[PDB]
Amino acid sequence: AVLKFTTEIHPSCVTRQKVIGAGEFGEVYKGMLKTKKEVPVAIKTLKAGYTEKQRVDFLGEAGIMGQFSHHNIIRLEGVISKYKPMMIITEYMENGALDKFLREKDGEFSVLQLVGMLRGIAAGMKYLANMNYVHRDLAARNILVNSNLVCKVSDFGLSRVLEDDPEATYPIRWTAPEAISYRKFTSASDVWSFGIVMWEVMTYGERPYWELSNHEVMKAINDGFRLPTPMDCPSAIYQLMMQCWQQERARRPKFADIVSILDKLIRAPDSLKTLADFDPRVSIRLP
Numbered sequence: 001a002v003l004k005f006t007t008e009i010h011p012s013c014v015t016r017q018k019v020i021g022a023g024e025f026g027e028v029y030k031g032m033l034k035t036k037k038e039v040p041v042a043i044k045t046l047k048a049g050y051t052e053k054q055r056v057d058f059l060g061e062a063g064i065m066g067q068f069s070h071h072n073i074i075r076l077e078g079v080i081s082k083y084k085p086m087m088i089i090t091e092y093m094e095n096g097a098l099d100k101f102l103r104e105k106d107g108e109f110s111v112l113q114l115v116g117m118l119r120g121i122a123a124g125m126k127y128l129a130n131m132n133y134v135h136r137d138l139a140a141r142n143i144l145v146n147s148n149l150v151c152k153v154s155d156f157g158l159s160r161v162l163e164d165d166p167e168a169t170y171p172i173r174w175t176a177p178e179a180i181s182y183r184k185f186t187s188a189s190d191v192w193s194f195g196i197v198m199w200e201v202m203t204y205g206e207r208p209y210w211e212l213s214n215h216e217v218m219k220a221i222n223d224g225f226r227l228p229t230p231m232d233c234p235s236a237i238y239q240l241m242m243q244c245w246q247q248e249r250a251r252r253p254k255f256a257d258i259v260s261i262l263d264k265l266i267r268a269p270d271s272l273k274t275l276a277d278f279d280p281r282v283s284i285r286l287p
């Protein structure tokens with residue numbers, strides 16, 4: 001039923017040009033779509049021999065995305081299902097995944113730009129939550145960035161989301177305690193993950209909890225430790241991420257609250273000049 005909302009695209013309208021992602025059962029390409037001149041698109045394929053579950057999971061991502069229409073959610077152009085290999089075609093995000101982007105652009109943005117990226121992510125997440133969609137895998141690696149610096153939530157589906165992410169192990173350090181301990185994934189566990197994303201953005205893609213093992217992370221969280229403030233981080237931003245990490249689900253902000261706060265800070269940007277204290281890990285003394 002959900003696929004009837006998607007446009008079926010003829011293969012002659014699609015040219016794959018360059019591989020930008022890859023796995024065992026398909027690749028992601030940058031390419032062009034010619035329905036105006038040709039427009040750039042991203043193209044994900046599913047290779048022949050796929051199972052019934054793989055087909056349901058693959059087209060299910062497109063079916064979910066076709067239900068959404070929001071500035072901060074990746075837009076679906078259409079699908080190729082009548083021909084093989086099958087494909088999903090979306091808008092092309094020129095700057096790729098947010099985690100890699102920030103690590104390759106360390107120090108290159110203003111604090112206001114970084115906070116603007118978080119407001120966009122939060123707006124997309126508010127929309128998903130209100131559409132009754134729990135993401136389960138919110139992380140900077142699953143946000144895409146375009147040439148306007150707009151961040152859009154990516155990576156949709158059911159079981160395929162955690163199955164396909166190599167960070168998800170039998171990822172812990174993005175996941176709220178109740179989701180780990182008793183499998184309770186909700187929009188409030190997505191808020192926990194969003195707090196981790198805030199820390200990823202403000203640190204230019206530092207890995208959460210550094211080299212602590214998964215067990216060490218869980219033990220630290222259960223004992224009350226939390227990630228320390230990033231360098232040069234507005235106090236209001238650190239306070240907000242901390243509240244995303246409340247152990248008690250009910251004490252966490254909703255995405256509605258997050259969007260409202262971030263919007264107010266951006267609209268009075270001097271509010272971002274007050275920085276949380278950074279605890280230095282190296283002492284440099286000079287006479």
Ligand SMILES: Cc1nc(Nc2ncc(C(=O)Nc3c(C)cccc3Cl)s2)cc(N2CCN(CCO)CC2)n1
Nearest residue numbers: 020021042043044074088090092093094095096154155
């Ligand atoms: C991984 C990656 N993606 C990029 N853009 C994308 N746009 C949309 C994507 C996407 O996957 N759509 C999608 C599809 C198609 C189906 C189902 C679901 C979805 Cl969400 S991927 C750009 C990019 N690069 C550009 C910048 N380079 C800098 C050098 O380091 C690095 C590589 N790399």
